[PDB]
PDB file of C-alpha atoms in Angstrom:
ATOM      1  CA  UNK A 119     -31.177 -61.805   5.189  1.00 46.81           C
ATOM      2  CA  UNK A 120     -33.054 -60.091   2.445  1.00 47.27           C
ATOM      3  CA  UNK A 121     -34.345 -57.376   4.283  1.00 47.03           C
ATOM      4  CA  UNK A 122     -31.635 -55.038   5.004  1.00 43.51           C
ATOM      5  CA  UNK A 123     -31.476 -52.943   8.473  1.00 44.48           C
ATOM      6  CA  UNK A 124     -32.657 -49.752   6.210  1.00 45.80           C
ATOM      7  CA  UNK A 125     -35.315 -49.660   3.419  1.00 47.56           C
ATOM      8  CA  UNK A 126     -37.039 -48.074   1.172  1.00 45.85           C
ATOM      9  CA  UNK A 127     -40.918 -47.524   0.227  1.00 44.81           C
ATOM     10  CA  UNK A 128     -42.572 -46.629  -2.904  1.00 48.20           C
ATOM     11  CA  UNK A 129     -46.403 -46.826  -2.914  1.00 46.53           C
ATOM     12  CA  UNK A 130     -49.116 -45.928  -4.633  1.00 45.35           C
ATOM     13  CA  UNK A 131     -52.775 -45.910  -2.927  1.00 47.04           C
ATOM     14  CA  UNK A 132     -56.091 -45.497  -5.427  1.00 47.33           C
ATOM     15  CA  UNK A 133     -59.536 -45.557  -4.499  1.00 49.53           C
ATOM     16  CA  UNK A 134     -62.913 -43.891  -3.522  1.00 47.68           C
ATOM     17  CA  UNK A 135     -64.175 -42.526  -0.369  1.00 48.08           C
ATOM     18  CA  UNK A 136     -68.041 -41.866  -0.855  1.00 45.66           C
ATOM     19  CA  UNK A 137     -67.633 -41.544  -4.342  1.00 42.53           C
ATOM     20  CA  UNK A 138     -64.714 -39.266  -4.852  1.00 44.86           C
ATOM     21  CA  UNK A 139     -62.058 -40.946  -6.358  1.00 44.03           C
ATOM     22  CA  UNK A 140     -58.787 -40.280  -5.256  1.00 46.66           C
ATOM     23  CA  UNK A 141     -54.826 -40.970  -5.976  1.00 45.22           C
ATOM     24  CA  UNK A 142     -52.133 -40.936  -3.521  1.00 41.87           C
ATOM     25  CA  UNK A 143     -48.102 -41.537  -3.927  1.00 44.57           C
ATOM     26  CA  UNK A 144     -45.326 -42.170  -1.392  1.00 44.68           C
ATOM     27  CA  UNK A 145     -42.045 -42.758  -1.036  1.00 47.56           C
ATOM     28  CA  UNK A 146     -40.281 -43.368   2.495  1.00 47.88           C
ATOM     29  CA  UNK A 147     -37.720 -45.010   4.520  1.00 47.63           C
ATOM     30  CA  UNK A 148     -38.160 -47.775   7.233  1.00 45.38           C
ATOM     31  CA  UNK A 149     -35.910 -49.598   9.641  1.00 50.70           C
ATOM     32  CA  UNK A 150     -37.807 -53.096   9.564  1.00 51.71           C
ATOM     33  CA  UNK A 151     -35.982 -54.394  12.669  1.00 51.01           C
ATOM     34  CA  UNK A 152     -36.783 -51.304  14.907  1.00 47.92           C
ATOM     35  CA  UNK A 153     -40.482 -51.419  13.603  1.00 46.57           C
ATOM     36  CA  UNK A 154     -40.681 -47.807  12.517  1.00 47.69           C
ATOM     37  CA  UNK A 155     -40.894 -45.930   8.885  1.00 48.42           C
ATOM     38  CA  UNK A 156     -41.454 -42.583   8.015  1.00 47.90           C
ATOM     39  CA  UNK A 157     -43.457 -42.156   4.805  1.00 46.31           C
ATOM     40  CA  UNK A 158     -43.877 -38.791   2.240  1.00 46.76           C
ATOM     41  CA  UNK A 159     -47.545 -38.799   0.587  1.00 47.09           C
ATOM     42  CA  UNK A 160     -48.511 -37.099  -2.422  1.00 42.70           C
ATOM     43  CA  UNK A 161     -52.531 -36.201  -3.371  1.00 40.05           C
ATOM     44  CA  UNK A 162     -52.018 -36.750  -7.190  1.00 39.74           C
ATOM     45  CA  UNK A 163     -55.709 -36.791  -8.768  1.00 42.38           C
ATOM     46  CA  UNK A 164     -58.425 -35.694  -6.719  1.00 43.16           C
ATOM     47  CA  UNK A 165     -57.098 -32.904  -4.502  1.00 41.23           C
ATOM     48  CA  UNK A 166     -58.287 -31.391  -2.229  1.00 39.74           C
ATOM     49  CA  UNK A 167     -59.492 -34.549  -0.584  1.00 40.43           C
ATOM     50  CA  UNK A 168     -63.051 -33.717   0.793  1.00 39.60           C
ATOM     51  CA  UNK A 169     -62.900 -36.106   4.250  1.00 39.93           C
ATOM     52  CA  UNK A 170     -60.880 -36.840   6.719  1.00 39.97           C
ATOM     53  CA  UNK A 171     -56.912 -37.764   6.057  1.00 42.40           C
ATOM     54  CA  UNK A 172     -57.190 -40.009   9.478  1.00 43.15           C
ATOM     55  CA  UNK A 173     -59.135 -43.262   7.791  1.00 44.34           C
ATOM     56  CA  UNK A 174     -56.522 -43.977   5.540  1.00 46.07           C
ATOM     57  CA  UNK A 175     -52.949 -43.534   7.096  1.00 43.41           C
ATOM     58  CA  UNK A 176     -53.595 -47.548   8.444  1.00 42.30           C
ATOM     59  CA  UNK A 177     -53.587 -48.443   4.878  1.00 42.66           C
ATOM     60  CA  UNK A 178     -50.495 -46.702   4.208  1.00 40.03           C
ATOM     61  CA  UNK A 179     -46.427 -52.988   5.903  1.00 39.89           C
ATOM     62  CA  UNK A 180     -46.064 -55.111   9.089  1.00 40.18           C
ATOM     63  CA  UNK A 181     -42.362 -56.064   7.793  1.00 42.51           C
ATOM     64  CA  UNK A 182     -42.205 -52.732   9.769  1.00 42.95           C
ATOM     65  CA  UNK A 183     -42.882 -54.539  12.874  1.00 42.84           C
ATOM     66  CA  UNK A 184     -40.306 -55.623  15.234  1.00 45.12           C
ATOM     67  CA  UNK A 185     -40.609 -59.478  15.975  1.00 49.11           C
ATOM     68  CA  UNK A 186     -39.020 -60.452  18.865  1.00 50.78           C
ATOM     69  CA  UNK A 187     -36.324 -63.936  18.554  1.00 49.22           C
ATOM     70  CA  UNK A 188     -39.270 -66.250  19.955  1.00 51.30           C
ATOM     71  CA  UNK A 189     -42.160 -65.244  18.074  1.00 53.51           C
ATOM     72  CA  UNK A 190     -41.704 -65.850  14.104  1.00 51.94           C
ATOM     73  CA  UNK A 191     -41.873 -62.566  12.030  1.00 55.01           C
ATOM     74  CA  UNK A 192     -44.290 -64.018   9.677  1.00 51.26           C
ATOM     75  CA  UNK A 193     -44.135 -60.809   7.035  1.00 52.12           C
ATOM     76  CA  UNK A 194     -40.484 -60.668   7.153  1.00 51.11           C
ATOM     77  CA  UNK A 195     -40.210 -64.151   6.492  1.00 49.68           C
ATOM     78  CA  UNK A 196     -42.435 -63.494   3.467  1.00 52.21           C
ATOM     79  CA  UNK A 197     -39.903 -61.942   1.428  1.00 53.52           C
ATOM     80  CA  UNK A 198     -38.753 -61.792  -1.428  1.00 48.48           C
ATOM     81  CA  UNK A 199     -42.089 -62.754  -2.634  1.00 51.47           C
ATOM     82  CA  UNK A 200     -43.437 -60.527  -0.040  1.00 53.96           C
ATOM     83  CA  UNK A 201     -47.591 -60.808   1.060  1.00 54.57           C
ATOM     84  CA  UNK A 202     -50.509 -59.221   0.584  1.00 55.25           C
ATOM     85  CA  UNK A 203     -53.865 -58.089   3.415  1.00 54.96           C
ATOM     86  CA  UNK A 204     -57.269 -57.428   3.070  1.00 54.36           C
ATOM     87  CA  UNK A 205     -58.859 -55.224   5.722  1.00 56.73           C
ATOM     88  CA  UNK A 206     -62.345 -54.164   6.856  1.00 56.25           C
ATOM     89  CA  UNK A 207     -62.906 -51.026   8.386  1.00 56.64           C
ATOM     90  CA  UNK A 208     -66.529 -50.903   9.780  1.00 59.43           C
ATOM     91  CA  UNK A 209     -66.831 -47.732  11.826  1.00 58.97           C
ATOM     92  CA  UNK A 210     -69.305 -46.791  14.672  1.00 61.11           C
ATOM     93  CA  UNK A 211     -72.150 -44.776  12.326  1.00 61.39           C
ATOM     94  CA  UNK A 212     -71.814 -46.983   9.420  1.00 61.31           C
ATOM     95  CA  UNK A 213     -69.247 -45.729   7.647  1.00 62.31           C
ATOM     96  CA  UNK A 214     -67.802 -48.748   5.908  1.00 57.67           C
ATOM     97  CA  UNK A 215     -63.893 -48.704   4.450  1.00 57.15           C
ATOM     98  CA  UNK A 216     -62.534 -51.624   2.581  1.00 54.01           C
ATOM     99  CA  UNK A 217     -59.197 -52.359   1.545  1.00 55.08           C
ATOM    100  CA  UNK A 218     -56.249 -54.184   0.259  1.00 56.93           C
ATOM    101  CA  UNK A 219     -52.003 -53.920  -0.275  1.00 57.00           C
ATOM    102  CA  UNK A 220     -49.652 -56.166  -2.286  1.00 55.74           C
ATOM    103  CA  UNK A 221     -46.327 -55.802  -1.287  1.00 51.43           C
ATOM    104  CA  UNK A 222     -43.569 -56.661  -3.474  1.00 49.69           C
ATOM    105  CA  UNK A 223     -39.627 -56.029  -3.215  1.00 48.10           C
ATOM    106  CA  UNK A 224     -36.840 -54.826  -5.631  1.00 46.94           C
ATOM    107  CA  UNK A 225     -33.839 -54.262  -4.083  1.00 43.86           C
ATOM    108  CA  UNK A 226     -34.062 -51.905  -1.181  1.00 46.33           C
ATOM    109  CA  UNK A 227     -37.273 -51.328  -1.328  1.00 46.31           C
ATOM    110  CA  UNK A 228     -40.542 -52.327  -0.576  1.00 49.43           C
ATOM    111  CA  UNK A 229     -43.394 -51.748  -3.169  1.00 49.43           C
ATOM    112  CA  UNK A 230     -46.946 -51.998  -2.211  1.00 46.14           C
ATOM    113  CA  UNK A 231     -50.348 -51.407  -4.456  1.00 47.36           C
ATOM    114  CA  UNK A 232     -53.018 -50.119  -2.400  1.00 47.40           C
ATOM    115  CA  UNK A 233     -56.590 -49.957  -3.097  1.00 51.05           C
ATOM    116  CA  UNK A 234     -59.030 -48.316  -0.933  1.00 51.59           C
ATOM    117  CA  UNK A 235     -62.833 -47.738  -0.552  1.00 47.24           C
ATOM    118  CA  UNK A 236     -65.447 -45.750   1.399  1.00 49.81           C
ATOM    119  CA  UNK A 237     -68.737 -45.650   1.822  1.00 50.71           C
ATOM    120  CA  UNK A 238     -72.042 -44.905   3.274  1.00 49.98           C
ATOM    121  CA  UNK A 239     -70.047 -42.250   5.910  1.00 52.89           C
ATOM    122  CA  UNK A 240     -72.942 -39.680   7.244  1.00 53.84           C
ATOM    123  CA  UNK A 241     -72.322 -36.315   5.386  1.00 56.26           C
ATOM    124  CA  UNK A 242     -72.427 -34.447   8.832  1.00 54.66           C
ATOM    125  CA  UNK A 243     -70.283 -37.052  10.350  1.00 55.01           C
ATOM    126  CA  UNK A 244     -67.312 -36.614  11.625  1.00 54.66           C
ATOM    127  CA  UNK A 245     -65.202 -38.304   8.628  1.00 58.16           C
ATOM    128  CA  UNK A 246     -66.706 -35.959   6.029  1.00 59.36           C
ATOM    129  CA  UNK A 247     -66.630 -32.961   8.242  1.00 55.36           C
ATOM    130  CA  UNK A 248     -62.873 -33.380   9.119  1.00 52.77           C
ATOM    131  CA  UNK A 249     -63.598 -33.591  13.212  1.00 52.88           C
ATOM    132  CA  UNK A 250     -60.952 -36.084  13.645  1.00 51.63           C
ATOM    133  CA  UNK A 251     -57.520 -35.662  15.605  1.00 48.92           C
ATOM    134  CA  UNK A 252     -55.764 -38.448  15.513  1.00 51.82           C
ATOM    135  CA  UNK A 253     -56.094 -43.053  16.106  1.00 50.94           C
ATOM    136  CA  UNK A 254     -55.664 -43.803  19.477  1.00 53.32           C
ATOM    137  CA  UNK A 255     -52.361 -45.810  20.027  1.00 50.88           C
ATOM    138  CA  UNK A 256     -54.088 -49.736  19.900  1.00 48.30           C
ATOM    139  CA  UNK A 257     -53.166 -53.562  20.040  1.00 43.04           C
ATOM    140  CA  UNK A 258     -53.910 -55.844  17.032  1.00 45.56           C
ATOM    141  CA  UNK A 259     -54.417 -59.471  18.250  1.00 45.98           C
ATOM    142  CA  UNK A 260     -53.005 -61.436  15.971  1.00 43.87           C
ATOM    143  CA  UNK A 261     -53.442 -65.270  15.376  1.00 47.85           C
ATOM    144  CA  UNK A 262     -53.849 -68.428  12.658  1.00 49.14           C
ATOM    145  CA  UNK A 263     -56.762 -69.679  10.871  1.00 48.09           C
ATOM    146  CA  UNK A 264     -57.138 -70.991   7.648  1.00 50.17           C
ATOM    147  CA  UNK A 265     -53.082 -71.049   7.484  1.00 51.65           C
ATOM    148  CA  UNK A 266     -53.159 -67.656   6.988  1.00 51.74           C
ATOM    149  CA  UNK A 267     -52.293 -64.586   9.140  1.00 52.58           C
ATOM    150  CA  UNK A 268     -55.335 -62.548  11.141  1.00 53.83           C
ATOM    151  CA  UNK A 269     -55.618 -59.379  12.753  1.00 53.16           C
ATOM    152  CA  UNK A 270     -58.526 -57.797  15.473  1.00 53.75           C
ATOM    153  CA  UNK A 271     -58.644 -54.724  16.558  1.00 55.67           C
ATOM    154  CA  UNK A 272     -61.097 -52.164  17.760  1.00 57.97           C
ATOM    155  CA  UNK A 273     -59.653 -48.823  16.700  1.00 53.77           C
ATOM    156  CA  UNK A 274     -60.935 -45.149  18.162  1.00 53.82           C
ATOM    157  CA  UNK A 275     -60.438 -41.748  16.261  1.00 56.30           C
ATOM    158  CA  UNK A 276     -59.964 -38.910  18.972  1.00 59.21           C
ATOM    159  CA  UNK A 277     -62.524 -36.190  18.009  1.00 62.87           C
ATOM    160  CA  UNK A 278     -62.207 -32.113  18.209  1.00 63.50           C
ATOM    161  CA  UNK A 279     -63.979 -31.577  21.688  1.00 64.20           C
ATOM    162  CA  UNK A 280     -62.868 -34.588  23.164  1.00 64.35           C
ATOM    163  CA  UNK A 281     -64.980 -37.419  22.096  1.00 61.71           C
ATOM    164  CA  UNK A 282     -64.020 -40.601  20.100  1.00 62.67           C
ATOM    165  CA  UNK A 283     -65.219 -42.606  16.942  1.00 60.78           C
ATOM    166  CA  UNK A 284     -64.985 -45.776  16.960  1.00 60.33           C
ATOM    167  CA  UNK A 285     -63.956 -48.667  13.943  1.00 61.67           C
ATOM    168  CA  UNK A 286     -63.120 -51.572  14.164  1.00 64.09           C
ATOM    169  CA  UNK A 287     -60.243 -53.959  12.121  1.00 62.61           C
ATOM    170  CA  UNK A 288     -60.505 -56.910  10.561  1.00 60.20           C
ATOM    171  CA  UNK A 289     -57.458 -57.664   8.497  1.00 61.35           C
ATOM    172  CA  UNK A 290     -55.991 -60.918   6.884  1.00 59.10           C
ATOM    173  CA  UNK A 291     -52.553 -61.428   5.695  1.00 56.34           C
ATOM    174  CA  UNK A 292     -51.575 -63.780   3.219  1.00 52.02           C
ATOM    175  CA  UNK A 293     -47.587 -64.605   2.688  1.00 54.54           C
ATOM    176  CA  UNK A 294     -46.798 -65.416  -1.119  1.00 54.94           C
ATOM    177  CA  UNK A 295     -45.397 -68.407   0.032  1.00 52.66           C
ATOM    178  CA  UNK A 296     -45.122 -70.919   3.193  1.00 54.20           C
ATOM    179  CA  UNK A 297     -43.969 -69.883   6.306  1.00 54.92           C
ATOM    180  CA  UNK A 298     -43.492 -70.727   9.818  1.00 57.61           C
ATOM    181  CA  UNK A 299     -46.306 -69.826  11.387  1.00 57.68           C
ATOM    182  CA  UNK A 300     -46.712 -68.215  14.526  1.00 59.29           C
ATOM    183  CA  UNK A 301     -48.576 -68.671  18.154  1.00 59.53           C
ATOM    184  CA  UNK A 302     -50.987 -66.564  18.649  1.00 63.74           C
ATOM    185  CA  UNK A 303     -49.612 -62.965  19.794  1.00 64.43           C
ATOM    186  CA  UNK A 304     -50.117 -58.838  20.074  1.00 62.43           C
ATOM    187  CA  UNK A 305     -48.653 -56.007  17.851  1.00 63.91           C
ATOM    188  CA  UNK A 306     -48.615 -52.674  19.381  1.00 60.77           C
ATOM    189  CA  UNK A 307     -49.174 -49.697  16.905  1.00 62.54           C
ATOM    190  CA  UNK A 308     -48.884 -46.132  17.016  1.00 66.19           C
ATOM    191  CA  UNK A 309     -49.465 -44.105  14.068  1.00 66.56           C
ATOM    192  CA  UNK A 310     -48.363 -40.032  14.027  1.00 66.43           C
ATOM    193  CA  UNK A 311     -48.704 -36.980  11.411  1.00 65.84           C
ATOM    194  CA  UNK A 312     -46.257 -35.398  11.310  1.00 65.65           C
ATOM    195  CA  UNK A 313     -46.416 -32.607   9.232  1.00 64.02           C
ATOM    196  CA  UNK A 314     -48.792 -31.682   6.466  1.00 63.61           C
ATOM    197  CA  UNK A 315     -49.617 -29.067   4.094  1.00 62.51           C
ATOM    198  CA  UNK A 316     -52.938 -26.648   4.317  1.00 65.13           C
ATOM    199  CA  UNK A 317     -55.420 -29.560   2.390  1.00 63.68           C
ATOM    200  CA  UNK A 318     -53.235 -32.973   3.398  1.00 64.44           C
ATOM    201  CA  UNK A 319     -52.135 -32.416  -0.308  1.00 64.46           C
ATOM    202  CA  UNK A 320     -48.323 -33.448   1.403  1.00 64.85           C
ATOM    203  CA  UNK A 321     -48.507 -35.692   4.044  1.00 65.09           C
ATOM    204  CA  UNK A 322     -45.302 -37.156   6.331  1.00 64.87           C
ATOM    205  CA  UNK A 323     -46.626 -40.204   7.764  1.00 62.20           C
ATOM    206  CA  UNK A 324     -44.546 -42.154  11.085  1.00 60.62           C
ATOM    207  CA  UNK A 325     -45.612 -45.390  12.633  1.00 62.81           C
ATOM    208  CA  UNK A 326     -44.625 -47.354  14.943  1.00 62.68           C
ATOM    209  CA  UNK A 327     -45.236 -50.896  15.670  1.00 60.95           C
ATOM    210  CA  UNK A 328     -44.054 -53.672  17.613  1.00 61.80           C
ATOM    211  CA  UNK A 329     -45.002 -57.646  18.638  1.00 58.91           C
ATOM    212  CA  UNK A 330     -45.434 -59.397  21.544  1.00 56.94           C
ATOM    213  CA  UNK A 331     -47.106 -61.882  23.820  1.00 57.92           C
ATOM    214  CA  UNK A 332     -50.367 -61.500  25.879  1.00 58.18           C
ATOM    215  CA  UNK A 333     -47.458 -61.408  28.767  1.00 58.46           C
TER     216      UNK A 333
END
């Protein structure tokens, strides 16, 4: 197997968010088999960020979900070549998010290129006002078309007060080369801060993740 029971992550994540460009760095650990990863981000051009931390840390590798023996780990399988996703983020006042990751591996380690982009969020709202707590824990449905590798989810941010903000996931993945393909199944995610700095300047990032059937 090329993916070994511990790795390593090195990213780097570039974009805009309304305008304000923005660079971010990581470096992490994961244990691909047990579906979880712990990652260390970095604001390196554009700090402070001006909106919330919350619409990104998605963007921040399904090789970090645990397949089960009877459902084929398509992103694992991927590798060394690795595979790349393209995701739309269309949230419940407009705010739109767009973005993409190759992922690459050297060694131990997983390498992904992230680009990400914002727009058209309401400047009162509660991305650009920093009202949100944390992503509900969600399912992605995940199935085949176009012999490539979907994923639907509708997504809600918790708000301060109680309320929550809704956005909804559209993501393809695309392995660098062919695969077995899978039967349509479910990944359960759960994302977690936990611990940052005074402006999300330092970030440690957890998520979990983990596939199975409807069943």
């Amino acid at each position: 197997s090329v993916i070994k029971p511990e790795m390593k992550i090195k990213l780097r994540m570039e974009g805009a968010v309304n305008g304000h460009k923005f660079v971010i760095e990581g470096e992490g650990i994961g244990k691909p088999y047990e579906g979880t990863q712990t990652l260390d981000l970095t604001v390196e051009e554009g700090a402070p960020l001006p909106f919330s931390y919350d619409i990104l840390t998605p963007a921040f590798n399904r090789a970090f979900t645990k397949y089960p023996e009877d459902i084929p780990d398509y992103f694992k399988q991927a590798f060394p070549e690795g595979y790349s996703w393209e995701r739309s983020m269309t949230y419940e006042d407009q705010g739109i998010c767009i973005a993409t990751s190759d992922i690459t591996m050297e060694g131990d380690c997983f390498f992904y290129e992230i680009r990400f982009d914002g727009t058209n969020f309401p400047p009162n709202g509660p991305v650009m006002q920093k009202k949100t707590l944390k992503w509900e824990p969600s399912t992605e449905k995940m199935y085949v078309e176009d012999g490539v590798l979907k994923g639907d989810v509708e997504m809600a941010l918790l708000l301060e007060g109680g309320g929550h903000y809704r956005c909804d996931f559209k993501t393809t993945y695309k392995a660098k080369k062919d695969v077995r393909l899978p039967d349509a199944h479910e990944v359960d995610h759960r994302t977690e801060i936990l611990s940052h700095d005074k402006d999300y300047n330092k970030v440690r990032l957890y998520e979990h993740a983990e596939a199975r059937y409807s069943g």
